[PDB]
Amino acid sequence: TALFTMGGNAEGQPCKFPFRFQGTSYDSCTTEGRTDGYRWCGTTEDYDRDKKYGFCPETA
Helix, strand or coil: CCCCCCCCCCCCCCCCCEEEECCEECCECCCCCCCCCCCECCCCCCCHHHCCCEEEEECC
């Protein structure tokens, strides 16, 4: 699927790859920090700085 926020908080922006989080670069959906089942993506170059994200497809 393509990436949309759809639950996400990043002002309607689609996922940004590669996004930096925990000083580590991610080019795919992560589950770090979510114990609710959902997988998220950063929506900027650096998530650590910005703190705006989107949702990603679970079971991927």
